[PDB]
Amino acid sequence: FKIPIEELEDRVFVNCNTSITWVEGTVGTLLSDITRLDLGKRILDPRGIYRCNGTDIYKDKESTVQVHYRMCQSCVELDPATVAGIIVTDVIATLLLALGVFCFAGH
Amino acid sequence: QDPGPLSVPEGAIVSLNCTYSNSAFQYFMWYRQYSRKGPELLMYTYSSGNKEDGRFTAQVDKSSKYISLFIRDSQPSDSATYLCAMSKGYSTLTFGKGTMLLVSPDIQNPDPAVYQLRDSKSSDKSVCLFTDFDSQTNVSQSKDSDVYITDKTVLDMRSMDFKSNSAVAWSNKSDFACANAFNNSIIPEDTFFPSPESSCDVKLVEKSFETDTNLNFQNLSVIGFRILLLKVAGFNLLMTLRLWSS
Amino acid sequence: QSFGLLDPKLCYLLDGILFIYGVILTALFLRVK
Amino acid sequence: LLDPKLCYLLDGILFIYGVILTALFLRVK
Amino acid sequence: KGNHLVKVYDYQEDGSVLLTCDAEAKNITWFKDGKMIGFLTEDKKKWNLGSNAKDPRGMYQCKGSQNKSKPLQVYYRMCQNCIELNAATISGFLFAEIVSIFVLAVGVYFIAG
Amino acid sequence: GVTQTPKFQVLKTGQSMTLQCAQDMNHEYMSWYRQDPGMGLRLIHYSVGAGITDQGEVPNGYNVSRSTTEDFPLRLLSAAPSQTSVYFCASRRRQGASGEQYFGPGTRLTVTEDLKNVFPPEVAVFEPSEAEISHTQKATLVCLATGFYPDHVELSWWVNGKEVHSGVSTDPQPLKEQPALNDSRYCLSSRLRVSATFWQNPRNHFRCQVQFYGLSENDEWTQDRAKPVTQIVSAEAWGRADCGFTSESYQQGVLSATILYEILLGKATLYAVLVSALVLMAMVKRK
Amino acid sequence: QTPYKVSISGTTVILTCPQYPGSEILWQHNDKNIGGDEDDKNIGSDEDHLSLKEFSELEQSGYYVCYPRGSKPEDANFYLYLRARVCENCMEMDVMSVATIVIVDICITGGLLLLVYYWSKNR
Amino acid sequence: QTPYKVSISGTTVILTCPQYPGSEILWQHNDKNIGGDNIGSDEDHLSLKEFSELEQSGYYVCYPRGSKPEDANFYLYLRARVCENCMEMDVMSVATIVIVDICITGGLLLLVYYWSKNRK
Ligand SMILES: CC(C)CCC[C@@H](C)[C@H]1CC[C@H]2[C@@H]3CC=C4C[C@@H](O)CC[C@]4(C)[C@H]3CC[C@]12C
Ligand SMILES: CC(C)CCC[C@@H](C)[C@H]1CC[C@H]2[C@@H]3CC=C4C[C@@H](O)CC[C@]4(C)[C@H]3CC[C@]12C
């Protein structure tokens, strides 16, 4: 027995035949009707555990679902060479100031 | 079986019926045909009584010689055509003509208006639009021969649990405006014809601000260049105070 | 509203360095005269 | 504000101040 | 059809560019500029080109069980490193240039004299 | 289940045609109907067993056959304008023992008197207005398709390369332009409604698509203009905000900042070389 | 509950089924068996791991279960639903750590200048 | 054989097929017979003035006069985006602007140096 997660225009929803019980994680927002939950925008990474209850043929059964998104939006792309270039220029500039000081401190 | 579209509001009991005088049939059923699709069987009874399948319920009165069908707790997804059919024991079923049904939704907060949509720069029309009604409003066809009016439809947006009514007017000619487009229709008082003095909200545009990874990388390169300038400018101050003090 | 890694806090901090420099030179210029 | 032009223009003023004040400082002493 | 069976699958949510091979088989092999670059069995059917801000070019092919297909030339130019020449750009350039050359020349004046 | 082929078909007066019915659950007997406004389902022919056929109610101009036990086609000898209808195929198990009928999906036909009347459609998208965005904080888009004959279209919306089904309402019936003439063209409209903070993104991509069914590669064409065939017409838009500060102007700000700091850093290294060389030459002149 | 563990390092995703210590754990993706059957060199299995190399966002994203060998899949009562975006050489910074790298750079420079200044006064 | 060549100058995109030495050339964009008698077909070119991203993007092909389109050699896909008064910044135009600005302000410092040296 699956819980059906659906994706509207740019949001996430939990859809069930009866009401939804929170367990941990994102709180959400109940809609006009009960039995649907609204977890916010997809790019802000909703994460949590939710629990529903069954009817029809699945009457007297119970499932759980865990939601997990990783929309990589505070991420940065870099090779393992350009890091070495950046460390090289910062070291050389600090030694350039350090050569600058002790010529001032004699005159 | 009588034709002609009937109206039932949202959430009530609907009554359909067929009269088959005169024969003595055994087998009875009901079909349903949506728009531009094919018929579909609902219920199949050949004993007098009730053969329930959910919120659908058929009845047959034998010596009274009619069949019937009750639908309860009805939604706007039941607008279709219902076709009652029968046969003897042998082949060649006999159909009726069919009955059209429309269900109208609940309209919890009305706010009627007429808006002027922006043009297209590739065709030379202009569209006015008459949105959410209260479902008691009737929309009438056009007086002219160059102005086109469509009927009213119901759309459903499930990302807000909201549903609404619409109607669209369009024409080629000049001297066409949204103050004189829906003139032939009956109209409520206190609709909303706007003025072209524009109002764009500024705190509302900031709620949709995405970010790439290229933009993150470009901001970190600016934060590199600024530290390099501050260090080299410090070296310049030290050397010029050296030459200035002697 | 997702800034990600484009907050204005970074830009305002890096101006704060030069602000500290201006404060110190005003302090020495007062404490001479 | 999100707009960075006020962030770049806000340090353009502090640079010019830091030039003027050191110029007067070396004029005194 | 004429042995054109490579297509472009654009406008995704991220800026990715995907190619599809329209041949009925398993184990499709790919090509760029005549040489082999990849390998792809079932449960994946699309070759990934990357984001379109890197604006790919080249000529691609794909084969299945029969012979190879005819190439496809791709050319994106989505400029992404462009500066527009307005009042504000030219005034910003000239303001920075004027104040920098003035401060530098004052310093050289006191070093020399 | 019962399937049939084709869906839509156009032909000229005095031209034959054959259309297929199929079945896959081992039933034995099948039929043909036609449906018209005000009449409903009228029977044409049927076939109680593999080998035997019968007549129905309107059988003029329909020759059938039953070769196998899953197939039952239908031929038009010559075409007449009164053949313009919608055709269905049914199936039952065995002679009233279990009377569940299963119908097909349909097949629409038009017969015209001349092939110089077939036209493809023209599509346009009309962007939402600002008074709706500030008054109710939702936004609506309209697609219009105009001036096409015959009426054999299918319309859809596509947002970021994928079909949407929520928030759409299309007209049931295609309107006519002037309803007085005989060969008159049609028109059809459709709507999509979206929240306000989804249209304000300059990153979302919206389009409307129309699939037209017309002529083919076997037909004479001695007319000046192009040959109206089966093709897809479409129209697009990017989302757009009017006022305020988007992620389109941030990028311009950052690009001009990087090139200005590159220039300024070059000038500072020039001055560092100059005063370094001056201090070295003074160091030589001390000795 | 006891949740799943999802680890993302490069273009590789590693899941961990936490439930059963002493079993043989079998996996399933969108009602299709996966892992433990030697096709797809990119997809392997371990004691309670499932390694997914060269992960794709568009395909290969949905429901995942784990269940001990000898049972049906239709008696599972806990699923996963993930979507991930990966690309090669893509780390995941924050706003706090970048500010700490700036502050550490400035303080190390100030310490070096003070040390050289008093070493040059003592000459 | 030899790929197409794309030339962009402002808002004018000009593409070329150097594959057919002597024949007459017919162009076609998304199965829609483009060119001939906005859009102007030259001896061997195809000019496209005032280019639009959403309108002109997709498949192009040139084929000799009287042949079929499904046979030629291969197709072009392009997806472009033009600007007016825009100058695009590589790592080469950047190098020319940096080096020329260095070489101009390396002379005014000599004028201030020698002028202030020949004063006092
Ligand atoms: C040591 C430092 C302070 C020297 C340079 C500071 C001043 C003179 C420079 C450096 C960065 C520059 C800014 C960089 C970017 C922009 C955005 C552009 O759209 C207009 C000009 C504007 C706003 C520049 C104005 C001048 C500026 C503020
Ligand atoms: C290239 C720009 C952005 C930064 C480079 C720093 C150099 C050019 C600037 C920064 C601070 C400046 C100094 C600030 C104050 C004075 C005191 C005045 O009585 C003579 C000039 C003098 C001594 C300036 C010389 C030039 C100087 C050293």
PDB file of C-alpha atoms in Angstrom, chain F residues 31-204:
ATOM      1  CA  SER F  31     -22.064  -4.951 -35.509  1.00  0.00           C
ATOM      2  CA  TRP F  32     -21.849  -1.474 -37.052  1.00  0.00           C
ATOM      3  CA  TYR F  33     -23.733   1.685 -36.054  1.00  0.00           C
ATOM      4  CA  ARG F  34     -23.853   5.334 -37.065  1.00  0.00           C
ATOM      5  CA  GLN F  35     -24.763   8.254 -34.805  1.00  0.00           C
ATOM      6  CA  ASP F  36     -26.359  11.527 -35.936  1.00  0.00           C
ATOM      7  CA  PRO F  37     -27.971  14.502 -34.144  1.00  0.00           C
ATOM      8  CA  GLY F  38     -31.563  13.667 -33.285  1.00  0.00           C
ATOM      9  CA  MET F  39     -31.469   9.998 -34.291  1.00  0.00           C
ATOM     10  CA  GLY F  40     -29.028   8.089 -32.117  1.00  0.00           C
ATOM     11  CA  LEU F  41     -27.679   4.629 -32.774  1.00  0.00           C
ATOM     12  CA  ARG F  42     -28.959   2.949 -35.954  1.00  0.00           C
ATOM     13  CA  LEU F  43     -27.785  -0.549 -36.933  1.00  0.00           C
ATOM     14  CA  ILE F  44     -26.254  -1.279 -40.346  1.00  0.00           C
ATOM     15  CA  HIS F  45     -25.154  -4.941 -40.477  1.00  0.00           C
ATOM     16  CA  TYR F  46     -24.215  -7.776 -38.142  1.00  0.00           C
ATOM     17  CA  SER F  47     -22.865 -11.310 -38.224  1.00  0.00           C
ATOM     18  CA  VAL F  48     -24.103 -14.026 -35.825  1.00  0.00           C
ATOM     19  CA  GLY F  49     -21.197 -16.383 -36.527  1.00  0.00           C
ATOM     20  CA  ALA F  50     -17.946 -16.759 -38.411  1.00  0.00           C
ATOM     21  CA  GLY F  51     -19.224 -17.010 -41.974  1.00  0.00           C
ATOM     22  CA  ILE F  52     -22.808 -15.687 -41.805  1.00  0.00           C
ATOM     23  CA  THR F  53     -23.860 -12.024 -42.059  1.00  0.00           C
ATOM     24  CA  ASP F  54     -27.239 -10.283 -41.727  1.00  0.00           C
ATOM     25  CA  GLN F  55     -28.861  -6.951 -42.605  1.00  0.00           C
ATOM     26  CA  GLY F  56     -29.858  -4.203 -40.200  1.00  0.00           C
ATOM     27  CA  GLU F  57     -31.783  -0.931 -40.437  1.00  0.00           C
ATOM     28  CA  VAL F  58     -29.954   1.399 -42.865  1.00  0.00           C
ATOM     29  CA  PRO F  59     -27.905  -0.971 -45.074  1.00  0.00           C
ATOM     30  CA  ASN F  60     -27.726   1.073 -48.321  1.00  0.00           C
ATOM     31  CA  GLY F  61     -24.148   1.056 -49.591  1.00  0.00           C
ATOM     32  CA  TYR F  62     -22.299  -1.161 -47.119  1.00  0.00           C
ATOM     33  CA  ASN F  63     -20.734  -4.498 -48.115  1.00  0.00           C
ATOM     34  CA  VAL F  64     -19.348  -6.540 -45.228  1.00  0.00           C
ATOM     35  CA  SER F  65     -17.587  -9.902 -44.822  1.00  0.00           C
ATOM     36  CA  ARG F  66     -16.501 -12.292 -42.059  1.00  0.00           C
ATOM     37  CA  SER F  67     -13.317 -14.215 -42.897  1.00  0.00           C
ATOM     38  CA  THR F  68     -11.728 -14.892 -39.504  1.00  0.00           C
ATOM     39  CA  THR F  69     -13.379 -14.934 -36.066  1.00  0.00           C
ATOM     40  CA  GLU F  70     -11.882 -11.627 -34.863  1.00  0.00           C
ATOM     41  CA  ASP F  71     -12.292  -9.317 -37.876  1.00  0.00           C
ATOM     42  CA  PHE F  72     -15.219  -7.559 -39.549  1.00  0.00           C
ATOM     43  CA  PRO F  73     -14.450  -4.648 -41.919  1.00  0.00           C
ATOM     44  CA  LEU F  74     -16.843  -2.272 -43.677  1.00  0.00           C
ATOM     45  CA  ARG F  75     -16.620  -0.940 -47.221  1.00  0.00           C
ATOM     46  CA  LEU F  76     -18.114   2.116 -48.874  1.00  0.00           C
ATOM     47  CA  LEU F  77     -18.766   1.510 -52.563  1.00  0.00           C
ATOM     48  CA  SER F  78     -18.939   5.151 -53.582  1.00  0.00           C
ATOM     49  CA  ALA F  79     -19.114   8.115 -51.254  1.00  0.00           C
ATOM     50  CA  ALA F  80     -22.071  10.467 -50.872  1.00  0.00           C
ATOM     51  CA  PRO F  81     -22.420  13.554 -48.633  1.00  0.00           C
ATOM     52  CA  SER F  82     -25.013  11.702 -46.517  1.00  0.00           C
ATOM     53  CA  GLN F  83     -22.297   9.361 -45.217  1.00  0.00           C
ATOM     54  CA  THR F  84     -20.966  12.128 -42.914  1.00  0.00           C
ATOM     55  CA  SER F  85     -21.306  10.515 -39.496  1.00  0.00           C
ATOM     56  CA  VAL F  86     -19.571   8.762 -36.585  1.00  0.00           C
ATOM     57  CA  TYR F  87     -19.197   4.970 -36.808  1.00  0.00           C
ATOM     58  CA  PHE F  88     -19.029   2.468 -33.920  1.00  0.00           C
ATOM     59  CA  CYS F  89     -18.375  -1.265 -33.561  1.00  0.00           C
ATOM     60  CA  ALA F  90     -19.799  -3.552 -30.857  1.00  0.00           C
ATOM     61  CA  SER F  91     -19.426  -7.161 -29.693  1.00  0.00           C
ATOM     62  CA  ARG F  92     -21.372  -9.704 -27.603  1.00  0.00           C
ATOM     63  CA  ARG F  93     -20.439 -13.118 -26.251  1.00  0.00           C
ATOM     64  CA  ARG F  94     -22.906 -15.706 -27.592  1.00  0.00           C
ATOM     65  CA  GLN F  95     -26.526 -14.911 -28.609  1.00  0.00           C
ATOM     66  CA  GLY F  96     -28.090 -13.230 -25.591  1.00  0.00           C
ATOM     67  CA  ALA F  97     -26.598 -15.554 -22.962  1.00  0.00           C
ATOM     68  CA  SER F  98     -24.540 -12.690 -21.480  1.00  0.00           C
ATOM     69  CA  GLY F  99     -25.699  -9.325 -22.775  1.00  0.00           C
ATOM     70  CA  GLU F 100     -22.751  -7.064 -21.943  1.00  0.00           C
ATOM     71  CA  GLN F 101     -21.964  -5.033 -25.037  1.00  0.00           C
ATOM     72  CA  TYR F 102     -18.552  -3.458 -25.519  1.00  0.00           C
ATOM     73  CA  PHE F 103     -18.379  -0.529 -27.927  1.00  0.00           C
ATOM     74  CA  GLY F 104     -15.406   0.828 -29.828  1.00  0.00           C
ATOM     75  CA  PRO F 105     -13.862   4.291 -29.583  1.00  0.00           C
ATOM     76  CA  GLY F 106     -15.337   5.809 -32.774  1.00  0.00           C
ATOM     77  CA  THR F 107     -14.356   6.909 -36.267  1.00  0.00           C
ATOM     78  CA  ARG F 108     -15.346  10.284 -37.739  1.00  0.00           C
ATOM     79  CA  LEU F 109     -15.858  10.750 -41.494  1.00  0.00           C
ATOM     80  CA  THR F 110     -16.669  13.724 -43.709  1.00  0.00           C
ATOM     81  CA  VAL F 111     -17.447  13.660 -47.428  1.00  0.00           C
ATOM     82  CA  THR F 112     -16.927  16.890 -49.366  1.00  0.00           C
ATOM     83  CA  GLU F 113     -17.641  17.651 -52.996  1.00  0.00           C
ATOM     84  CA  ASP F 114     -14.207  19.173 -53.724  1.00  0.00           C
ATOM     85  CA  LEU F 115     -10.766  19.042 -52.095  1.00  0.00           C
ATOM     86  CA  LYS F 116     -10.122  22.791 -52.440  1.00  0.00           C
ATOM     87  CA  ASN F 117     -11.880  23.402 -49.116  1.00  0.00           C
ATOM     88  CA  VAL F 118      -9.446  21.744 -46.701  1.00  0.00           C
ATOM     89  CA  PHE F 119      -7.604  24.244 -44.492  1.00  0.00           C
ATOM     90  CA  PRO F 120      -5.130  23.961 -41.615  1.00  0.00           C
ATOM     91  CA  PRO F 121      -5.574  26.042 -38.433  1.00  0.00           C
ATOM     92  CA  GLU F 122      -3.815  29.143 -37.063  1.00  0.00           C
ATOM     93  CA  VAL F 123      -2.875  29.302 -33.376  1.00  0.00           C
ATOM     94  CA  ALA F 124      -2.267  32.285 -31.061  1.00  0.00           C
ATOM     95  CA  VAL F 125      -1.597  32.668 -27.315  1.00  0.00           C
ATOM     96  CA  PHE F 126      -2.796  35.759 -25.425  1.00  0.00           C
ATOM     97  CA  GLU F 127      -0.902  36.704 -22.241  1.00  0.00           C
ATOM     98  CA  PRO F 128      -2.766  37.560 -18.994  1.00  0.00           C
ATOM     99  CA  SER F 129      -3.564  41.077 -17.847  1.00  0.00           C
ATOM    100  CA  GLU F 130      -2.232  42.948 -14.818  1.00  0.00           C
ATOM    101  CA  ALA F 131      -5.617  43.841 -13.304  1.00  0.00           C
ATOM    102  CA  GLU F 132      -6.272  40.159 -12.668  1.00  0.00           C
ATOM    103  CA  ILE F 133      -2.833  39.635 -11.125  1.00  0.00           C
ATOM    104  CA  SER F 134      -3.372  42.487  -8.681  1.00  0.00           C
ATOM    105  CA  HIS F 135      -7.077  41.901  -8.036  1.00  0.00           C
ATOM    106  CA  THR F 136      -7.330  38.117  -7.450  1.00  0.00           C
ATOM    107  CA  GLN F 137      -3.622  37.037  -7.617  1.00  0.00           C
ATOM    108  CA  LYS F 138      -4.099  34.292 -10.242  1.00  0.00           C
ATOM    109  CA  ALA F 139      -3.496  34.457 -13.987  1.00  0.00           C
ATOM    110  CA  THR F 140      -5.239  33.052 -17.099  1.00  0.00           C
ATOM    111  CA  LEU F 141      -3.956  32.315 -20.608  1.00  0.00           C
ATOM    112  CA  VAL F 142      -6.134  31.878 -23.739  1.00  0.00           C
ATOM    113  CA  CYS F 143      -5.333  29.843 -26.872  1.00  0.00           C
ATOM    114  CA  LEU F 144      -7.347  30.510 -30.068  1.00  0.00           C
ATOM    115  CA  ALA F 145      -7.355  28.302 -33.193  1.00  0.00           C
ATOM    116  CA  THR F 146      -9.238  29.729 -36.157  1.00  0.00           C
ATOM    117  CA  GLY F 147     -10.292  29.051 -39.719  1.00  0.00           C
ATOM    118  CA  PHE F 148      -9.887  25.314 -40.339  1.00  0.00           C
ATOM    119  CA  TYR F 149     -11.897  22.809 -42.372  1.00  0.00           C
ATOM    120  CA  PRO F 150     -12.722  19.935 -41.712  1.00  0.00           C
ATOM    121  CA  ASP F 151     -13.128  19.623 -37.944  1.00  0.00           C
ATOM    122  CA  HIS F 152     -10.480  17.099 -36.948  1.00  0.00           C
ATOM    123  CA  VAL F 153      -8.320  18.714 -34.230  1.00  0.00           C
ATOM    124  CA  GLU F 154      -6.910  17.774 -30.772  1.00  0.00           C
ATOM    125  CA  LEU F 155      -5.528  20.437 -28.381  1.00  0.00           C
ATOM    126  CA  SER F 156      -3.093  20.301 -25.433  1.00  0.00           C
ATOM    127  CA  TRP F 157      -0.943  22.450 -23.123  1.00  0.00           C
ATOM    128  CA  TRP F 158       2.762  21.877 -22.368  1.00  0.00           C
ATOM    129  CA  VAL F 159       4.614  23.479 -19.432  1.00  0.00           C
ATOM    130  CA  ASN F 160       8.421  22.915 -19.273  1.00  0.00           C
ATOM    131  CA  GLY F 161       8.272  20.075 -21.773  1.00  0.00           C
ATOM    132  CA  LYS F 162       5.516  18.046 -20.073  1.00  0.00           C
ATOM    133  CA  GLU F 163       1.742  17.816 -20.465  1.00  0.00           C
ATOM    134  CA  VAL F 164      -0.498  19.263 -17.793  1.00  0.00           C
ATOM    135  CA  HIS F 165      -4.053  18.155 -17.094  1.00  0.00           C
ATOM    136  CA  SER F 166      -4.982  20.337 -14.094  1.00  0.00           C
ATOM    137  CA  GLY F 167      -6.353  23.852 -14.525  1.00  0.00           C
ATOM    138  CA  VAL F 168      -7.542  23.453 -18.146  1.00  0.00           C
ATOM    139  CA  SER F 169     -11.015  23.832 -19.699  1.00  0.00           C
ATOM    140  CA  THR F 170     -11.532  23.468 -23.461  1.00  0.00           C
ATOM    141  CA  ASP F 171     -14.799  24.001 -25.344  1.00  0.00           C
ATOM    142  CA  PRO F 172     -16.828  20.828 -26.007  1.00  0.00           C
ATOM    143  CA  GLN F 173     -18.003  21.789 -29.480  1.00  0.00           C
ATOM    144  CA  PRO F 174     -16.226  23.755 -32.218  1.00  0.00           C
ATOM    145  CA  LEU F 175     -18.185  26.896 -33.129  1.00  0.00           C
ATOM    146  CA  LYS F 176     -18.868  27.989 -36.714  1.00  0.00           C
ATOM    147  CA  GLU F 177     -17.847  31.320 -38.177  1.00  0.00           C
ATOM    148  CA  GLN F 178     -20.930  32.116 -40.214  1.00  0.00           C
ATOM    149  CA  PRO F 179     -23.538  29.397 -39.632  1.00  0.00           C
ATOM    150  CA  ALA F 180     -25.483  30.226 -42.799  1.00  0.00           C
ATOM    151  CA  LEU F 181     -23.271  28.790 -45.551  1.00  0.00           C
ATOM    152  CA  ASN F 182     -22.684  25.115 -46.336  1.00  0.00           C
ATOM    153  CA  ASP F 183     -18.880  24.733 -46.308  1.00  0.00           C
ATOM    154  CA  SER F 184     -18.023  26.979 -43.374  1.00  0.00           C
ATOM    155  CA  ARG F 185     -14.885  26.954 -41.230  1.00  0.00           C
ATOM    156  CA  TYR F 186     -14.657  26.459 -37.457  1.00  0.00           C
ATOM    157  CA  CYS F 187     -12.913  27.849 -34.364  1.00  0.00           C
ATOM    158  CA  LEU F 188     -12.056  26.542 -30.908  1.00  0.00           C
ATOM    159  CA  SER F 189     -10.677  28.064 -27.676  1.00  0.00           C
ATOM    160  CA  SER F 190      -9.034  26.867 -24.466  1.00  0.00           C
ATOM    161  CA  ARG F 191      -7.873  28.237 -21.094  1.00  0.00           C
ATOM    162  CA  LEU F 192      -5.145  27.574 -18.505  1.00  0.00           C
ATOM    163  CA  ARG F 193      -5.183  29.136 -15.038  1.00  0.00           C
ATOM    164  CA  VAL F 194      -2.038  29.419 -12.922  1.00  0.00           C
ATOM    165  CA  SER F 195      -1.084  31.190  -9.678  1.00  0.00           C
ATOM    166  CA  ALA F 196       0.553  34.587  -9.885  1.00  0.00           C
ATOM    167  CA  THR F 197       4.010  33.660  -8.546  1.00  0.00           C
ATOM    168  CA  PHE F 198       4.372  30.971 -11.222  1.00  0.00           C
ATOM    169  CA  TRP F 199       3.806  33.270 -14.213  1.00  0.00           C
ATOM    170  CA  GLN F 200       6.119  35.966 -12.761  1.00  0.00           C
ATOM    171  CA  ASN F 201       9.181  33.667 -13.255  1.00  0.00           C
ATOM    172  CA  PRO F 202      11.135  34.338 -16.436  1.00  0.00           C
ATOM    173  CA  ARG F 203      12.198  30.684 -16.365  1.00  0.00           C
ATOM    174  CA  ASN F 204       8.924  28.817 -17.056  1.00  0.00           C
TER     175      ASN F 204
END
